[PDB]
Amino acid sequence: NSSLPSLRDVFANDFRIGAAVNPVTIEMQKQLLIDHVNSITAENHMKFEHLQPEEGKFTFQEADRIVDFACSHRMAVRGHTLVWHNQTPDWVFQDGQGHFVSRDVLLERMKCHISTVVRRYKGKIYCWDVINEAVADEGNELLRPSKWRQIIGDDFMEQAFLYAYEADPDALLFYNDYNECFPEKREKIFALVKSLRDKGIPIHGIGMQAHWSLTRPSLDEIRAAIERYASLGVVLHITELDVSMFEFHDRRTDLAAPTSEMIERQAERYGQIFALFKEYRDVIQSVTFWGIADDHTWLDNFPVHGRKNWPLLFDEQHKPKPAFWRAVSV
Ligand SMILES: O[C@@H]1[C@@H](O)[C@H](O[C@@H]2CO[C@@H](O)[C@H](O)[C@H]2O)OC[C@H]1O
Ligand SMILES: O[C@@H]1[C@@H](O)[C@H](O)OC[C@H]1O
Ligand code: NA
């Protein structure tokens, strides 16, 4: 690694380079992080269930540790995430009797959570994924069903962004989602964000999760999505990048190691992806990987539990993979 290029330095004039972490991986992958990234995202510890597990009970310890690490190394921090249909405790939507609360009560709870969380990290966290995955991933409907939407109504996103803006008007607020480059969904995300911005809602950027495969989405689809979203005038962040060795239809669990073909195609894939990101450096301001080395990735258990994936630029021994060389040479 002595003579190895540093990711954040290579892309210094293009965009920040980030990694998703947790207290455990910060220790396990500390040197890689210190040598390559200038942005950090909490993989799980800033989600609702990990910040306010019970009403009035805030558990900022783990998030504080992540922020402390980032700040001690002059790394930016992306806040993830405030309002999402997943990883949110049941108490949030229920009353004493266990029945669903009213619109006003849920809005009060949403405002309280957002205000408390955002104000704590004001000045240390420069952006927040305010709304995560609200758009439907299947069907002809625009929005995915969720307790937030059911109880409050379809304007729940407008409210979330306004509450977050009030809490920290200097933060960049994002709508974050996956499968963001498939045409049908791209148009739903575009329509949603355009509608919000047309109402003056403080949504400053779109977060493209980029949980991609070797084949999907195509480079043309990625280019089209970047251009489509950029045309709204918002900032773009690639937020949870990883390149899975398995396509959606591939649920094999017996592969103990990736084939030389997988490794080679992944290298080509990462080179093509970063070449495209660099081309759009004027609108993309940050590229965060959902991890940093293959010794830790949520793809080991998703969508198939108990297997192994090799989605990042560094291997399990923290050594650069062929993908690393193609990525930094664009
Ligand atoms: O440890 C896992 C996390 O890595 C995972 O993170 C999510 C990945 O999918 C994205 O769409 C989400 O935004 C991101 O939070 O969440 C589940 C957890 O078990
Ligand atoms: O659970 C979600 C999964 O269904 C999607 O494919 O990727 C993002 C995850 O959060
Ligand atoms: Na840029």
Resolution (angstroms) stands at 1.5
Query: Which of 85, 211, 250 most suits a substitution to test ligand 2, by most atoms within 8 Å of the C-beta?
Result: 211
Q: Would you call 108 a catalytic residue per the annotation?
A: no
Residue 240 in contact with ligand 1 by CB distance below 6 A: yes
Name the active-site residue from 43, 158, 180, 240: 240
3 state SS of 39? strand
Q: Whose CA is nearest to atom 4 of ligand 1?
A: 298
d(CA 301, CA 179): 19
Residue 211 in contact with ligand 2 by CB distance below 6 A: yes
Query: Which of 302, 304, 305 most suits a substitution to test ligand 1, by most atoms within 8 Å of the C-beta?
Result: 302
> Scanning the structure block, which residue is given the tokens 């045409």?
183
Q: Would you call 279 a catalytic residue per the annotation?
A: no
Considering only CA atoms, which of 2, 17, 5, 1 is closest in space to residue 277? 17
Rounded to the nearest angstrom, the distance between the alpha carbon of 155 and the centre of ligand 2 is 23
Q: How was this model experimentally determined?
A: X-ray
Structural domains present in the chain: 1-330 (3.20.20.80)
d(CA 93, CA 145): 14
Q: Do residues 204 and 197 make contact, with C-beta atoms less than 8 angstroms apart?
A: no
SS (H, E, C) 159-190: HHHHHHHHHCCCCEEEEEECCCCCHHHHHHHH
Angstrom CA distances, 238 to 111, 114, 204, 213, 281, stand at: 27, 23, 14, 15, 12
